[PDB]
Amino acid sequence: GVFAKRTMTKTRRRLRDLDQIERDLRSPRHLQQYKETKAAEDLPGLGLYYCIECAKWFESETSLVGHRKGKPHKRRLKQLKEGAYTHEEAMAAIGYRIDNG
Template identity: 35%
Template sequence: VKMGSAQRHKAKKGHNMKAPKKRAALARFLNRHIDQVWKDVRADPEKEEANGIRADAALPRTSKQPVDEDLPGMGQYYCIETGRWFINKQALEQHKKSRFYKMRVKELKGAKPHCQRDAEAAVGLGVDNGPKLGRAPASQPQNMALEQ
């Protein structure tokens, strides 16, 4: 800049580079994690309910599902091992030939995957909410607790 002349515009900032990283971080938690999929693969679909990430997520454990217009392919083409829906049968078959699918299947054949609850239990940390307050023990009726 020459002396005495004003700067015409500010230099560009790098804010637009944050968006892809943020999107990837959010997407990481929208998909099912390996420990959740491990339970889905081993669970009996008739006996147990699917526990989804969200309360409204009825996650399939079989390929036959009711029609859902909000999902790709009307919710008919679901890969249990990766927890993804596909638009048609060809896309699902192509996915099952992919490296990601084969690695996931190999990973699911092994031991139970690590989860945070197991790690905390290993070092002695657990959920301890303490004794329930404001209630008499279940064995004694309320009026007997007041007399003592």
């Protein structure tokens, strides 16, 4: 079930994208900037329990561990294993390239 499914596609209800999550997994600096754009005291569990793949904060370590067994986390893992869609893949799909000399 999705909370308030009617307005789910609004920009003010937007969630973090899969390629951003891929860059977060590859580079801790990217994740650090994303976490800097938030306030730690307003986060669940003071921000101590975070799932990078789902880009989600949890209230406790047991909550995070229990979430890992669910199918949404496994869907995110399968999507990351398949690979996020990027501008490089979009360019390769039409056979376009970048000439830098």
